[model samples]
Target: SKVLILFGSSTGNTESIAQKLEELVAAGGHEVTLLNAAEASADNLADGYDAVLMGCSAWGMEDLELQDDFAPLFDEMENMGLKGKKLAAFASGDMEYEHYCGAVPAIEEKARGLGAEVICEGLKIEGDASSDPDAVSAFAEDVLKKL
Candidate 1:
């Protein structure tokens, strides 16, 4: 499968998680592309891909902000034509925050609204993939299973 992993990170935690996902997905013998959401556009973002994975960092304790780069792309997700596509979401945040890793839920909701199939549960990390490598690996395993 051709997989695209797009990530938006402020402090680099989410980026690290994205890298880990990319490694795992690539190791699964699938074609994978890892990109920063800052340089990605909503239109045709999922084109030519069997699966798309989105990861973002969360800001704010209660308000639950999505990373700046991802916000705009997410806002225009309707233009992505995700219908019948495979999707997964991941997020990194402070566990102490009120809405920890909130971006995961937001991504999932939007993906579903766009008629995409969420292949795996969102992988919410406290800091980064390094904080819990096995967890991210497990998430990737599930993704490969469903892909």
Candidate 2:
């Protein structure tokens, strides 16, 4: 299976998870591509992949502010070629926020609206994944089952 992981990280919490996910998926005997959202394109970024996994951080008040690079891409999600594709989201958020891990739902909602099938609920980590590696391992396992 060809899996695409597009993520944006500020303090490297989400980035840590993204790298761990890539290692896990690759270890699971699949092809995985890990990319920073900085280079993403709104037009067909997720095309030609078995599954597309997105990772981002939040900075908005109550609504949700996607990571800087991912923000522009989010606005153009309708053109990201997500139709009929298996999509999932992951994020590392601060528990102090009113809406912790908000990016997960934001991406999931947008993905659903764009016609992508939600393979599983989004992975929302409280702070850095390094503090809870087992959670990331579990998320990877869940994803492997579907792939």
Candidate 3:
């Protein structure tokens, strides 16, 4: 089955991870498409795919980067229906912040509302991607297993 990996990022960290996941999933023999959330639309995301993987990096106060930007679009996705699809999420955040993190959770909320069956808990990584290759790899492996 084909896989779709979409991401929203302020500093490219989330997109980097999304691309890595795309590579891993592709290596496992699935057709894959990686795109920014901003580039995705309901018509672009129909009922053909086997799984959907999404990501985002948190902004100030644990808010989603470019918050509300994708919300309306995702709400449209929900109305359009994505039932029975495998879904997973990941986020980049600063743990030191008062709010642990919220972007991934926020995306999860949208996925749930869209009726996407979440196969795993969202993975939130702190600060730097270069500092956590192993953790990211582990997360990618876990999500692949879920799919």
Candidate 4:
């Protein structure tokens, strides 16, 4: 399977998680591309990829806000040609926030609304990917199974 991992990170936590996922997925004998959401465009969402994994960190104290770099892409997601595509979301967030891993839910909802098939629930971690190896591995395994 060919997979594209697009991630936006404020403090590198989400990026770390994305890297771990990429390694795990690649080890399963799949091709994987890791992209920074800051440089990725909505136009490439469905480009030659069997599955797409999106990751971002949430901000804002009163409302859930996507990472600055990912907001534009999120706004243009409806034009990403995601219909019938496989999609999944993940996020790194501070547990002290009102909405833990808020970006995960928002991204999943948008993907579903755009006619994408969400393979699994979004992975939400309180800190970096290293903060919870078990959870990260489990999430990667689930994604691998879906592939």
Which regions of candidate 2 are displaced past 4 Å? none
lDDT of 2 by residue, 1-147 (tens): 899999999889899889989999999999899989887787888777989999899988778788898888888988888899998899998888877988888889889987899899889997777888898999899999988
List, residue by residue over 44-111, the lDDT tens digit for candidate 3: 47467878887676556634343333454555666435678888888776777654657677767877
| TM-score (all chains, Cα) for each model | 0.97, 0.95, 0.83, 0.97
Which residue pairs in model 2 clash with each other?
A: none
The candidate, 1 or 2, that scores higher on lDDT is 1
Q: Which 10 successive residues of model 4 have the least lDDT summed?
A: 38-47
- Tens-digit lDDT track for model 4 on 77-147? 98778888899999998888887888888988999998999999989998999999999999999999998
Clashes of each: 0, 0, 0, 0
Q: Candidate 2: count the clashes.
A: 0
lDDT of each: 0.90, 0.88, 0.72, 0.90
Q: Which model, 3 or 4, shows the larger TM-score?
A: 4
lDDT, candidate 1, 1-147, per-residue tens: 999999999989999999999998999899999999999989988899989999898777758777999989888999887899999999888877788888888889989988999988999888878999889999999999999
The reply for model 3, stretches above 4 Å from the true place, is 43-46, 62-69
